[PDB]
């Protein structure tokens, strides 16, 4: 029995069949179609710099309720517009309109985090300095 061929000269069939099947595995598909380059706002890169258009509070999904404090960013490298969450309690009032910002992914590999709908990106650095540093009061924002 068993669906596969077994014979000592099958080989080719085993190969081709495996290849065919591989396309149902999502990661593999992504790798091969190259959807990290063609689609996706970051050009298959770990980080991206963009310019802040405006500051937008986003209402969280259910069980929860709280205005999340995100930022609408337009990335420098391609010109694509994305929403980016600004972490920590203050921090939204470190950003301002027309400011250069360094965005990382959220930590779900393209997918949205937690309860914040349509947001796939963090804010790491504003005007060249780390948000965390600012928050902890280790450095100051050197204007814009």
């Amino acid at each position: 029995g068993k669906g596969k061929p077994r014979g000592l000269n099958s080989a080719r069939k085993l190969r081709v069949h495996r290849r065919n099947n591989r396309w149902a595995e999502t990661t593999y598909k992504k790798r091969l179609l190259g959807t990290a380059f063609k689609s996706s706002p970051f050009g298959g890169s770990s980080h991206a710099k963009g310019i802040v258009l405006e500051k937008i509070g986003i209402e969280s999904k259910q069980p929860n309720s709280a205005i999340r404090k995100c930022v609408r960013v337009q990335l420098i490298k391609n010109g694509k517009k994305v929403t980016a969450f600004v972490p920590n309690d203050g921090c939204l009032n470190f950003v301002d309109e027309n400011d250069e910002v360094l965005l990382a992914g959220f930590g779900r590999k393209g997918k949205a985090k937690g309860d914040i709908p349509g947001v796939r990106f963090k804010v790491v650095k504003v005007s060249g300095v780390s948000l965390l540093a600012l928050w902890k009061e280790k450095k100051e924002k050197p204007r814009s």
Binding site: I67, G90, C91, N93
Partner: protein
Amino acid sequence: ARAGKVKSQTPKVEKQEKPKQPKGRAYKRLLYTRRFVNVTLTNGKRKMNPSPS
């Protein structure tokens, strides 16, 4: 402002000037003493950080 209110509210309590911890191998030694040398006050299920209340 909506943002950053809780932090603003909180009383700015300062850190107490303490005797410094002995960092490195010394720290490890200290830890060992705390745990497996002294074996001080054992309930059966041996606790690490008990609440003072």
